[PDB]
Design a protein around this ligand. Structure first.
Ligand code: HEM
Length: 108
């Protein structure tokens, strides 16, 4: 790995202030701007039923792993050009560690 866990309580917060905006995490939460995150990891890109994902996302066939996801939150549009992720990224290794510790806990 190239991912080191961090603060789950730190993640929780980043995510509110940075992605709640368009997404929900709990099982049985709805899609909003972006898709619902429950059971993301180990899950392949663009596969939640009832959501219309860019053709970009869909063909990236990304395999969602803490590792995968970090590169991804860095700058998604570079990662998958054409995605309608309206997110410039988490420039910082730490915030990102924080968040995916979060995301790895809350989406499970
Ligand atoms: C905040 C740091 C943040 C997270 C975390 C996040 C996660 C994320 C993932 C992992 C996907 C891929 C989906 C898949 O099911 O395979 C994804 C997709 C989209 N997002 Fe998101 N996202 C974060 C930030 C933001 C913000 C702040 C918005 C809205 C302003 C947003 C929106 C979207 C959209 C739209 C998509 C789908 C893209 C496509 O089909 O190309 N995200 N999100």
């Amino acid at each position: 790995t190239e991912f080191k866990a961090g603060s789950a309580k730190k993640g929780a917060t980043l995510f509110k202030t940075r992605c709640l905006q368009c997404h929900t995490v709990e099982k049985g939460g709805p899609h909003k701007v972006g898709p619902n995150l429950h059971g993301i990891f180990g899950r392949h890109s663009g596969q939640a039923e009832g959501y219309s994902y860019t053709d970009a996302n869909i063909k990236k066939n990304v395999l969602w792993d803490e590792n995968n996801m970090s590169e991804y939150l860095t700058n998604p549009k570079k990662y998958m050009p054409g995605t309608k992720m309206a997110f410039g990224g988490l420039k910082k290794e730490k915030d990102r560690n924080d968040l995916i510790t979060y995301l790895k806990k809350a989406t499970e």
